[PDB]
RNA sequence: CGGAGCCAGCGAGUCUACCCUUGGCCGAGAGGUCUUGGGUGAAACUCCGUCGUGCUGGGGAUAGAGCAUUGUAAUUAUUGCUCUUCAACGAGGAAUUCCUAGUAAGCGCAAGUCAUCAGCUUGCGUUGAUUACGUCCCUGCCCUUUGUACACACCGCC
């Protein structure tokens, strides 16, 4: 048929580099692990807002997303994870700590779930993040509440902000880390099970919103 | 051809707190409790109606609000309640100035009114109340709104006396296997049944006749008695 | 196992309280362009 | 459900210190206070009045 | 190239060129039943005589995966699925065997 | 309408119907434009200089001095308009382009 | 429930609206020419789309 | 090729080079081992008792090569650390200087290092030999 | 009248200042530098922390800022503040000795934001003149007449006390009131250029050693 | 009339697609009253393509003869 | 003995009455002193 | 005599100063290895100059970095930018300005940080 | 708990036979001792064995025993270290304050600059986010109410 020379000796160096490592230069994935093609957002309208187009070697992109409005929804969502994951008074600024449970995780939601765990995290955000919700409409403070709409970003935001603060909780003072509670919250979320504390506050969210309609 | 449990040893019921977001229970908040402490010149009182001919007039306040014996014989009722000794409660209270306290079933609220009302001076100002075998931590003033701890899937009811009427019996067993039930009672002498619209999606009553507090509470509990065959 | 590809065992654990493990093992540059 | 007693104070002050079951401790509390406000007190009336 | 064998109250991995205790699992509470190997040989089953099957990952013995809690009497047998990878089968002393997605 | 920007200091704006000058304007300190850019929807002219690191932002409707844009370290060489978004693009001899 | 998607057409302005909360024209994607009015609570901007759980209603003011 | 100490990492320097002076037993354990702390402010000694000695001394021997000479205070003030003192804030201590001393003349009379002039000792020549050839044979058995 | 380096833009331009703590702020120092950046107007706060004090001068210098607050602190209680004038100015350093803040005693209310008007008492020397001038090039120049918010710089023996009033005019009188904090402030330095070099010449500091230091004030 | 001119392009901006259809038989009645429709041509003008210029998409898909 | 510098002066209700009727006959007269527009 | 190439990658107080010229094939940094650079999580921060274009461009070319100052992850990216730019500036010199700018393509499609740093900081709003 | 790898930037007037240092040796430890000459190094971090949700081994206040360094002379125990003793204490209500990118927060290291500060203050680097970046709906503060300034266009008597 037709096929393409584009190197002419077998590349070696004198520097001896691993063998998965050289591996590597066909295609970008994540810790070497896990590959970004095939991964697709499975809801439409939050395509444009979770990034899984730019793959990435490691969620230590040092870039600046801080500084125009909607510029994070271009920073993988890998890497919003993780820095949603370093914060609270006990972890803030170990983004290293935060990048090392993150692959902890992905290790073994792939090895209890045999499948793409950036797939089961893309489809625990856009299972996780609520469709609808209540403004204080407030009339000087009548209590009383109107349902509002919730846009794309929003519903980015306060995904992975369910799911990681869902995983401190649920690693507070049980036998498990935050790694492994991480692991079975974007399991549960990523399926849908009402077992997780992000989609059953997704859950009550959006049957509050039902009411108040 | 089931075959038994590997032990017949009858275990307590695990307490529940605020700890555990997960297991369906009953929580019962007393809203708008009268519970204010105040100084003699020297002494320190809880506010009653009868401590006094015009303390409350020189607060500001009327005398009718003054009333900590209800929510006590409140707390009474739902912690001799049937339910609460076999674990499926915890009672939590809020004060009509607005101070939230976490009822643990594993207390023993005292008989009598001074003693309780003794009781409710150190709460108020030291916010904690140990045990006397000091071990665990089993009355405490803790952080506002209610929803921060209340568990993630429970449907809010309020009770109240002008609402649809419903049977608790069939309304408990139509929320299902992990949902539980927050059934903002009012701890008033009198009052507008709007002390907690901001919480509740459904607001209903238990009776045809203008019910009593405790009444209500102790017919919730026997309701939910029932369907959870207790 | 089956494909074991090194040192093979055969083990067998006791009631005794002990475990038995049988196994069956497996110049110059000038000068050489010279 | 286990039943445990409330431990409280009865005729509770928040003002007044709780009542230690100890006469040497809470003294040395006691008086550790009272050294602390009257050394206070004195070293700044000498400083202001240095002034 | 390696086995773990189920003494009482730990399970020891030996390795198949030195024969010593390579690695050990000793945070069992009752009498640990049987120890066995995922198809991939990436994680360790183990059945316990409390009926708490729990998964470390092998040649890791300090990351315990996940406690299933089986049966409240002893579970005597756990081995993973030989064709499939997510379910493991346990049979305990409740006669009757359960099939866990994990 | 059409501006226009000079070595004497001055954008001014010129009426193409009537070939009227009507509107002048200068700045507060005495400099020399070298480049100017409009708005889409012309109420803003806006000038740079080449001795000056500022831009600026002169309403067409009053004459006034709306604003003097401060952030480039070097010479303002060129300003342009969005078509659409009306966003301006400077870019200076500090080897930065910057987006107001 | 079936739910519907819908692209946001213009960010409406200068309506009276509560703070936080934004009013929007959105329309539809299984027929592209009909708009409703819509209000959202997060951070929104032209041509992204929402998810609308019920389209039979429009929105008045919030205030 | 080319191999050194430059080459291999941390570990696999450290431990391979401490299975070595496991097995050779030409070390004299100072005998109070066992009891002692490596520090004043490690509240205990070391878990691996039946050894730590002969990964210490792989430890010193690998910063030995990639340093040129230290001595016994330089020795103390790497090794040392932080401290939870008390309910004070936290200042730096030192290491253990006999348990430093002993290690230096064990490999001393060893044979791995000398005295030097300025003070202090570095690498000999049948250490430096001897070091990189373990790192060889780390990478022939970790190929 | 205006002196040399603050002629060219005098009445000309409104000025623009930042309002930064010292590395670290306690809560009572970014409460009170709140209070500065809103007693004088067109002023902002910087969140001052791993700052560059090089760096910042220069993005300063270079965004168009005209002067810089820096404001340091002991245990809550503000001590200093230094005035930085940016295009290659000068820095006066003040130490603050008696500060009362609104944020510690009282809500009363909201303050005004109006241009205020400015009372100067008896600065009468040259030195005077000169505080005088870098006190009141950060305050926006031609305020309305009717203004209702006055402040004041007056000095009583090298000890500037600083208030800030709101008044109307009665029947009988004036009727004053206080408003933001109290201070007596006391320079210590001035120096002719910017606050990242400390090389610059100084025009003005005290001599808190000699033995005729306690004769004369503005010494 | 009472709408200001710096509001109007708002004022018909944030009405519905249904007050757009009642605004057009507003103007369809409006303009058989002819004393009305004189006194208040350029306003009537002025909304009215504004309007159909910012609904025209849609006002293009709906199908009845009535419109 | 002696000392360096004259110390701090305690603010005192004459010194805080004394700048206030001097402010309040400064504010009355309006002979103030601010910038002027150019 | 040699063809050899200097540049220099800098965050925010670590500088890596990247020498690169004709050879067989060694990326050296701080005279270990290119894979020893710690904190070995951040290693393919390291080597995304290298796989991002192959290694085939490297194949005839040895870098040496030093890098002084900084911390572990301002090191690593002082490193990363060093190698890029010196890999396109050796290119532009040595080899022919095509492949040059298919080099400063791939790396400014990847992150233009890896080429030009972001250096003067804050606003002062 | 027990080992190991590693990465900074400020700063630069000394007791010069008793100060500060490089190195040898003694003691588990602190420290001692003898010679040399007059800043190297951070912590958080990373890796490697072991434990395990329990006043926990987290804790270390309190009391005892022992070895020293120092203050004449311990004579109210000068302070360091070693082993026991394991009290209190479980993240903190109502309210309230501050905060928008190298920012909040974590981390250590130096200095001590005529005012201030050592019951601390100021520098310096290391690690580094979440959420706004819209709006006048609420709370306030401000501005204007002839368009003037020159066309075109809009407005058309607060």
């Known amino acids: 048929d037709f096929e393409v020379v584009e190197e002419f000796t077998p590349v070696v160096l004198a520097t001896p580099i691993p063998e998965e490592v050289q591996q590597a230069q066909t295609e970008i994935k994540l810790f070497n692990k896990w590959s970004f093609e095939e991964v697709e957002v499975k809801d439409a309208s939050l395509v444009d807002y979770v990034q899984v187009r730019q793959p990435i070697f490691v969620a230590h992109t040092a870039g600046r997303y801080a500084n125009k409005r909607f510029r994070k929804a271009q920073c993988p969502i890998i890497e919003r994870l993780t820095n949603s994951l370093m914060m609270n008074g006990r972890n803030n600024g170990k983004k290293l700590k935060a990048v090392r449970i993150i692959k902890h995780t992905l290790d073994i939601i792939n090895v209890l779930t045999d499948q793409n765990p950036i797939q089961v995290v893309v489809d625990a955000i856009t299972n996780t993040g609520p469709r609808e919700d209540t403004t204080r409409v407030g009339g000087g403070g009548a209590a009383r509440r109107q349902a509002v709409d919730v846009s794309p970003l929003r519903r980015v935001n306060q995904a992975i902000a369910l799911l990681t603060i869902g995983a401190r909780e649920a690693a507070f003072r049980n036998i498990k880390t935050i790694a492994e509670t991480l692991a079975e919250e974007l399991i549960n979320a990523a399926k849908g099970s009402s077992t997780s504390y992000a989609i059953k506050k997704k859950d009550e969210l959006e049957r509050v919103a039902k009411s108040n309609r | 051809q089931k075959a038994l449990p590997a032990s017949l040893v009858p275990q307590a019921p695990p307490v529940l707190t605020s700890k555990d977001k997960i297991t369906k229970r009953m929580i019962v908040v007393l809203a708008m409790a009268s519970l204010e402490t105040h100084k003699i010149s020297d002494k320190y009182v809880l506010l009653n109606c009868d401590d006094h001919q015009g303390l409350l007039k020189k607060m500001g306040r009327d005398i009718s609000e003054a009333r900590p014996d209800i929510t006590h014989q409140c707390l009474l009722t739902l912690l001799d309640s049937p339910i609460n000794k076999a674990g499926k409660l915890q009672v939590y209270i809020q004060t009509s100035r607005g101070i939230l306290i976490e009822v643990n079933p594993t207390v023993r609220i005292p008989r009598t009114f001074k003693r309780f009302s003794g009781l409710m001076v150190q709460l108020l100002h030291k916010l904690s109340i140990r045990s006397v075998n000091s071990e665990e931590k089993l009355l405490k003033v803790i952080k506002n709104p209610i929803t921060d701890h209340l568990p993630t899937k429970c449907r809010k009811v309020t009770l109240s006396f002008d609402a649809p009427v419903i049977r608790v019996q069939d309304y408990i067993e139509k929320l299902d296997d992990d949902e539980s039930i927050c059934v903002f009672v009012g701890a008033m002498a009198r009052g507008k049944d709007n002390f907690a619209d901001e919480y509740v999606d459904e607001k209903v009553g238990l009776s045809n006749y203008p019910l009593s507090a405790s009444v209500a509470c102790s017919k919730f509990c026997h309701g939910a008695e029932d369907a959870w065959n207790i | 196992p089956s494909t074991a590809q090194g040192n093979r065992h055969l083990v067998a654990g006791l009631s005794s309280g002990l475990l038995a493990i049988r196994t069956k093992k497996k110049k110059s540059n000038n000068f050489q362009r010279m | 459900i286990p039943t445990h007693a409330p431990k409280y104070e009865e005729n509770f002050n928040p003002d007044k210190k709780s009542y230690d079951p100890d006469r040497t401790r809470s003294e040395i509390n006691k008086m550790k206070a009272q050294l602390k406000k009257e050394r206070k007190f004195t070293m700044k009336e000498i400083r202001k009045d240095a002034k | 190239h390696d086995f773990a064998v189920t003494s009482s109250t730990r399970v020891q991995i030996f390795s198949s060129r030195t024969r010593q205790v390579i690695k050990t699992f000793s945070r069992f509470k009752d009498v640990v039943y049987s120890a066995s190997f995922r198809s991939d040989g990436k994680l360790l089953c183990a059945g316990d005589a409390t009926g708490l099957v729990s998964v470390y990952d092998s040649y890791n013995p300090r990351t315990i995966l996940l406690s299933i809690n089986a049966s409240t009497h002893p579970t005597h047998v756990t081995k993973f699925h030989t064709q499939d990878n997510k379910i493991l089968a346990t049979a305990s002393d409740d006669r009757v065997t359960r099939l866990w997605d994990i | 309408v059409m501006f226009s920007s000079s070595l004497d200091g001055t954008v001014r704006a010129w009426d193409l119907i009537r070939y009227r000058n009507f509107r002048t304007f200068t700045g507060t300190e005495r400099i020399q434009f070298n480049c100017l850019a409009v708005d889409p929807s012309g109420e803003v002219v806006c000038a740079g200089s080449l001795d000056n690191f500022d831009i600026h932002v002169w309403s067409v409707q009053t004459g006034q001095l709306l604003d003097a844009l401060s952030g480039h370290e070097g010479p303002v060489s060129c300003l342009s308009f969005s078509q659409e978004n009306s966003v301006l693009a400077s870019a200076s001899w500090d080897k930065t382009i910057r987006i107001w | 429930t079936p739910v519907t998607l819908a692209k946001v057409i213009k960010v409406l302005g200068r309506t009276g609206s509560r703070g936080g909360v934004t009013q929007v024209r959105v329309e539809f994607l299984e027929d592209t020419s009909r708009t409703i009015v819509r209000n959202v609570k997060g951070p929104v901007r032209e041509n992204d789309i929402l998810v609308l759980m019920e389209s039979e209603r429009e929105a008045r003011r919030l205030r | 090729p080319g191999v050194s100490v430059r080459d291999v990492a941390a570990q696999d320097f450290i431990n391979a080079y401490a299975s070595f002076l496991q097995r050779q037993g030409k070390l004299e354990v100072p005998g109070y081992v066992d009891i002692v702390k490596t520090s004043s402010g490690n509240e205990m000694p070391p878990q691996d008792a039946e050894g730590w000695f002969y990964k210490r001394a792989a430890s010193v021997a690998r910063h030995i090569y990639m340093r040129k000479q230290v001595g016994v205070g330089k020795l103390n003030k790497l090794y040392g650390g932080a401290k939870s003192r008390g309910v004070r804030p936290y200042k730096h201590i030192d290491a253990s200087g006999s348990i430093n001393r002993k290690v230096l003349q064990a490999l001393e009379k060893i044979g791995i290092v000398e005295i030097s002039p300025k003070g202090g000792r570095r690498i000999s020549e049948n250490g430096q030999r001897d070091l990189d050839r373990i790192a060889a044979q780390t990478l022939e058995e970790d190929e | 009248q205006v002196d040399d380096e603050y002629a060219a833009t005098s009445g000309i331009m409104d000025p623009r200042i930042i309002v930064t703590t010292s590395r670290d702020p306690s809560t009572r120092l970014s409460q009170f530098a709140k209070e500065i950046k809103l007693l004088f107007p067109n002023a902002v706060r910087l969140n001052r922390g791993n700052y560059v004090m090089p760096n910042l001068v220069d993005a300063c210098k270079k965004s168009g800022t005209t002067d810089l607050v820096v404001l340091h602190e002991h245990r809550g209680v503000p001590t200093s503040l230094t005035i930085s004038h940016f295009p290659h100015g000068p820095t006066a350093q003040f130490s603050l000795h008696n500060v009362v803040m609104r944020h510690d005693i009282i809500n009363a209310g909201n303050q005004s934001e109006v241009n205020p008007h400015l009372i100067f008492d008896n600065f009468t020397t040259a030195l005077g003149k000169r505080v005088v001038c870098i006190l009141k090039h950060l305050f926006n120049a031609g305020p309305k007449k009717d203004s209702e918010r006055v402040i004041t710089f007056a000095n009583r023996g090298d000890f500037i006390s600083v208030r800030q009033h709101v008044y109307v005019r009665t029947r009988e009188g004036v009727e004053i009131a206080e408003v933001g904090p109290r201070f007596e402030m006391r320079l210590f330095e001035l120096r002719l250029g910017t606050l990242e070099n400390k090389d610059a010449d100084v025009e003005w500091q005290l001599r808190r050693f000699i033995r005729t230091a306690n004769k004369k004030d503005y010494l | ?67 | 003995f002696d000392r360096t510098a004259k110390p701090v002066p305690v603010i005192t209700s004459e010194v805080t009455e004394s700048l206030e009727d001097m402010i309040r006959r400064r504010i009355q007269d309006s002979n103030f002193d601010d910038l002027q527009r150019r | 005599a040699v063809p050899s190439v200097q540049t220099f990658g800098k965050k925010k107080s670590a500088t890596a100063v990247a020498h690169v010229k004709a050879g067989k094939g060694l990326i050296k940094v701080n005279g270990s290895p290119i894979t020893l650079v710690e904190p070995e999580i951040l290693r393919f921060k390291v080597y995304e100059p290298l796989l991002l274009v192959g290694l085939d461009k490297f194949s005839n070319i040895d870098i040496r970095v030093r890098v002084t100052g900084g911390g572990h992850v301002s090191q690593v990216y002082a490193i990363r930018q060093a190698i890029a730019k010196g890999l396109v500036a050796y290119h532009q010199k040595y080899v022919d300005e095509q492949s040059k700018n298919e080099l400063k393509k791939a790396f400014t499609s990847y992150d233009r940080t890896l080429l030009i740093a972001d250096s003067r900081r804050p606003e002062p709003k």
Not at chain 10, 9 to 34: H, R
Not at chain 10, 38 to 59: A, R, T, V, Y
């Open chain 10, 1 to 67: 009339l009472r709408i200001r001119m710096s509001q109007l392009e708002d004022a018909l901006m944030v009405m519905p697609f249904s007050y757009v259809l009642k605004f057009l038989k507003f103007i369809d009645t409006v303009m058989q009253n002819k004393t009305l429709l004189h006194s208040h041509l350029p306003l009537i003008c002025k909304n009215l393509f504004f309007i159909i210029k910012f609904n025209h998409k849609e006002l293009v898909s709906q199908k009845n003869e009535e419109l």
